Amino acid sequence: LQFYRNLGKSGLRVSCLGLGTWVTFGGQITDEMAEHLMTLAYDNGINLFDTAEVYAAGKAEVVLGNIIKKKGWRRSSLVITTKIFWGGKAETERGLSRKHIIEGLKASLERLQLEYVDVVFANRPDPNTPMEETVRAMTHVINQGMAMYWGTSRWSSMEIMEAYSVARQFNLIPPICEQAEYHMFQREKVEVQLPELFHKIGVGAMTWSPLACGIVSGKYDSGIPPYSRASLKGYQWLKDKILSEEGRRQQAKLKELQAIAERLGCTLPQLAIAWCLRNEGVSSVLLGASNAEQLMENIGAIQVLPKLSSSIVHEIDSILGNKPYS
Amino acid sequence: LQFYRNLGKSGLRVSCLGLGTWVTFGGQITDEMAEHLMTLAYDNGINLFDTAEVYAAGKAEVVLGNIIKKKGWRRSSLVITTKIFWGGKAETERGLSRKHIIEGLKASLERLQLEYVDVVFANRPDPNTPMEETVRAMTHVINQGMAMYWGTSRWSSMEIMEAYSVARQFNLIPPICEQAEYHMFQREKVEVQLPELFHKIGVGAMTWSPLACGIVSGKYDSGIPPYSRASLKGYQWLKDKILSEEGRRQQAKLKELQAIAERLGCTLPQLAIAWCLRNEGVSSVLLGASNAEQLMENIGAIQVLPKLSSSIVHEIDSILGNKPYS
Amino acid sequence: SERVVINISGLRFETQLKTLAQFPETLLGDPKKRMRYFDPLRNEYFFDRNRPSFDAILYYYQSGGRLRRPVNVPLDIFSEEIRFYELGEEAMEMFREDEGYIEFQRQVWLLF
Amino acid sequence: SERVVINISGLRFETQLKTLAQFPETLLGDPKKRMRYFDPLRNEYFFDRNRPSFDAILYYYQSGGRLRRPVNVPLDIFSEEIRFYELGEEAMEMFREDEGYIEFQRQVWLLF
Ligand SMILES: NC(=O)c1ccc[n+]([C@@H]2O[C@H](COP(=O)([O-])OP(=O)(O)OC[C@H]3O[C@@H](n4cnc5c(N)ncnc54)[C@H](OP(=O)(O)O)[C@@H]3O)[C@@H](O)[C@H]2O)c1
Ligand SMILES: NC(=O)c1ccc[n+]([C@@H]2O[C@H](COP(=O)([O-])OP(=O)(O)OC[C@H]3O[C@@H](n4cnc5c(N)ncnc54)[C@H](OP(=O)(O)O)[C@@H]3O)[C@@H](O)[C@H]2O)c1
């Protein structure tokens, strides 16, 4: 129903949808296309735009950083987020140590040509760095004016809760959000473990890959289309899981879900995106797009969210047959 | 086995070996040689490079600061450490007071031409400054962006533990590491007192002088070679202990250890350096070198570390006859 | 091993989550039950209740069954706290046993 | 003189290290024994155990021998805590003494 919603308990207002810069920005699509996608997303009300220091070895933030500066948008109107972990080939340039968190975020801000990101993320848990060191560094870069908030990604509920209990121990800033994969074929984490944290400590969820990198869109039911996400260099891993025997049963269930999409007067991508927003813990969904048609189609999932009734939801949970045991 | 290892519990990844700038940089050897040694050490994977504000009255950091800027190495790839204490001939320019810790580190960063060192050290315990004042200052220079971490040197376990218990008292940053002398003739501290701290509070050990300033190398078995560390000006104290009666029994035990070095297919310096790395508390060993041959030989101690079995270790502990009573 | 802080009217109690999860039926053993008492600013569960009684309640989790009323806590007050923490009907009747507590003919059987 | 903080299920106990080192045989007197219970984030030793019993245990170090069961702690519970803290067989038998506790012919000697 409501478009903008608070990222977790915090007062940061983000749109229910957002534009990611993975694979596309500075890599798959041209920079001229990346400007067109942000301009469309920004003119459609989306303010949350996500990136990371690993995408295109920083060329994603350079692109994202140029679009923001070229368009001259008010910095107070944008919610820019970056993820810190894989900041170089050296030993001291990966992880969540006090050194790389500061160096990596300072480098990301340099590429983004921004004084601060709105949220800085830990791209994945780093078992080689103590939790106290990571929380103190994340609290440090917030007080220095490099970030308004900080959150986690790919962390377990036990690791998220520890960062909270350590922050309360040393009077530091707890994490406000968690990025977790969530589509119609990956739903165990965002529907079981995370909802307990959204009520206990109020950690929101910023889900990613609502279409499983395009698999849920249904374009791979015949083969690997050219200029797709599976045909690109370095994504043979995706082409393997798509053409695998397990990946073919996923496409088979899409035909049954395709009937629900046409029944509700929408497309299959719009159904799966709106299907992700049906939870209270999901504070936003990060959309991917390689052209203006895909992005403008994905934004249409806001209209499908009201059509999702318990009848339609239970019908989808029966077609998928992967509802996690609570 | 593993090359890079965490400095103590912290997430700072340092190489098991490192290059020091004592006596040599800006003093014994030329600056052209110092560049050649760092380039060799850096191209061999070593990222930990140690200095202090007292070495050559700051000319060591000037040299080290120029090599880093001349080579254009990524600051995120280097682990630069400096030690603060003897920062001048005045009364307020030595010790661990809030004044000199800040002034001394700010001066060291100026000579190093760096925004921050990775770890700032207390070169020795200062009984004229309260522990709370020293911990608050060390915590201060960390939050100001002048240092990522801070550690101690020549401190006793009781003094290290106090800095931890004071940091926990005032919600400050405890020390992460301790520099202590450790060679085949100095082993009481790193093998008895420090290991308890590495498990209790997780303070790592960055040992220094693995060859006792070259004594364990076995070059002083005949006399004082020219262009040696004992022949240099201001190091008559070393020539005294080498030519002393006690220092001659040390050279006598080296002949028995020389047999083990040739038996294991290595040199005597490589044995003693690898012998230092055989502990879990030893997070890194700071190597000295006055030429490219010595440095490239010392790096070969990584291969001797697997050859060090309990048979070889107990054989060395029998030749030395100084295993500390636990 | 996750630590749990329980605030009883100002009296601080700490334990491991596995100790409370040992009895998943009670209040503090059920995460959904104790959710309504959590303080996200202090990371603790606050209860505005009797203080001397909770020594034996938290020990009922540590000992894993033993429920001994404290010598200074009244019998009625301690017994009403067991109902709130929901230790179970089995442990409640064991507490009483440990304390010392064991038509045509229906109307004629009343006046006799 | 080094201070030692002992956390007993939320109850805070502080003492000097020399007081616990007075008895190097017990748990808290042996640094290697108490190592497994240290909390490097709070600088304290945490124990998820009974709370009213530890008043007398820590006083056994301060008094240097006296081991008097508290009047509100049961006899079995306090005695099982002495085993955990490992106060020693000499102090254990003194506690019982203070509380009040002192073939051809082998088969024929059984039925008689
Ligand atoms: N936590 C993390 O580390 C993490 C991990 C992954 C993603 N993320 C975030 O999630 C964002 C995007 O994730 P995602 O790429 O997985 O999104 P997705 O929705 O799962 O997949 C997007 C892909 O689907 C295809 N597609 C795009 N628009 C379409 C449309 N309208 N119809 C049909 N197909 C369409 C595109 O591939 P083609 O090029 O084949 O058209 C696009 O790359 C990233 O920018 C990143 O911010 C975060
Ligand atoms: N905590 C502290 O305050 C403290 C104290 C001392 C040292 N340190 C650290 O330790 C580092 C070095 O200590 P150190 O000089 O005592 O190291 P060391 O290994 O004990 O002695 C190094 C000396 O041995 C000789 N040598 C070097 N390479 C050799 C080789 N391959 N074969 C034979 N001999 C060789 C050189 O002297 P010649 O010039 O005679 O060749 C060199 O100066 C310093 O840079 C400093 O960072 C710290």
Residue B76 near residue A88, CB atoms below 8 Å: yes
Q: Directed axis angle between helix C89-99 and helix C75-85, to 10°?
A: 170
Residue with CA nearest ligand 2 atom 33: B217
Which chains does A contact via 3+ CB–CB distances below 8 A?
Answer: B, C, D
Structure tokens at A199: 């009520």
Written as six digits, the tokens of B221 are: 């078995």
Quick check: C37 contacting A, CB < 8 Å? Answer: no
Helix (H), strand (E) at residue B206: strand B204-208
A167 CA to middle of ligand 1, Å?
33
Closest approach of chain A CAs to the CA of D42, in angstroms? Answer: 8
CB distance C29 to C20 below 8 Å: yes
Task: Determine the Cα–Cα distance for residues B34 and B55; give it in Å rounded to an integer.
Answer: 14
* CA–centroid distance for B136 within its chain: 24
Active site residues of A: 55
Integer Rg of chain D from CA: 18
- Which partners does chain B have (≥3 C-beta pairs < 8 Å)? A, D
The secondary structure of residue A24, as a DSSP letter, is: I
Number of other CB atoms surrounding residue A151 within 10 Å: 28
H helices present in chain A, as ranges: 31-43, 59-71, 98-112, 131-143, 157-169, 194-200, 236-243, 245-263, 268-276, 292-299, 301-307, 310-320
**At how many degrees (to 10) do helices D75-85 and D89-99 cross?**
170
Residue type, A119: V
B193, B156 contact by CB (below 8 A)? yes
**SS3 category, A168:** helix
- Ligand 1 centre to CA of A320 (Å) is 21
| Contact assignment for D49 to C62 by CB distance below 8 Å | yes
The two three-digit tokens of residue D96, written as one number: 């019982």
Distance separating the N- and C-terminal Cα atoms of chain B: 26
Rounded CA gap, B26 and B21, in Å?
Answer: 8
Residues present in chain B in total: 326
The H-or-E segment that residue B263 falls in is: helix B245-263
DSSP state for residue C34 in the 8-state scheme = G
Any CB–CB contact under 8 A between B143 and chain A?
yes
DSSP state of A181: B
- The CB-side HSE value for B2 (13 A sphere, CA atoms) comes to 11
Amino acid, single-letter form, for residue D14: E
Phi-psi region of D95 (alpha: psi -120 to 50; beta: other; left: phi over 0): alpha
Alpha-carbon gap, residue B99 to B129, rounded angstroms: 11
> Do A297 and A219 form a contact (C-beta atoms < 8 A)?
no
* Cα angle: D49, vertex D55, D60; to 5 degrees: 110
| Nearest CA-CA partner of B139 in B190, B101, B82, B86 | B101
Q: State the helix-helix crossing angle for B131-143 and B157-169, rounded to 10 degrees.
A: 70
Closest CB to D38 among B162, B165, B200? B200
D41–A132 C-beta distance less than 8 A = yes
**How far is it, in rounded angstroms, from Cα A124 to Cα A52?**
12
Whether B182 is catalytic: no
B195: three-class secondary structure by DSSP: helix
Tell me chain B's radius of gyration from C-alpha atoms.
19
User: From the list D9, D46, D71, which residue is nearest C58 (CB)?
Assistant: D9
- Inform me whether the C-beta atom of residue A309 falls under 8 Å from chain D C-beta atoms: no
The continuous run of DSSP H or E covering C77 comes out as helix C75-85
Which residues in chain A are closer than 8 Å to C3, comparing Cβ atoms?
A: 165
Strand partners, B207: B285
Technique behind this structure? X-ray
DSSP line for chain D:
--EEEEEETTEEEEEEHHHHTTSTTSTTT-TTTGGGGEETTTTEEEE-S-STTHHHHHHHHHHTS-----TTS-HHHHHHHHHHHT--HHHHHHHHHHHT---TTTTTTT--
Check if B13 contacts A (Cβ < 8 Å).
Answer: yes
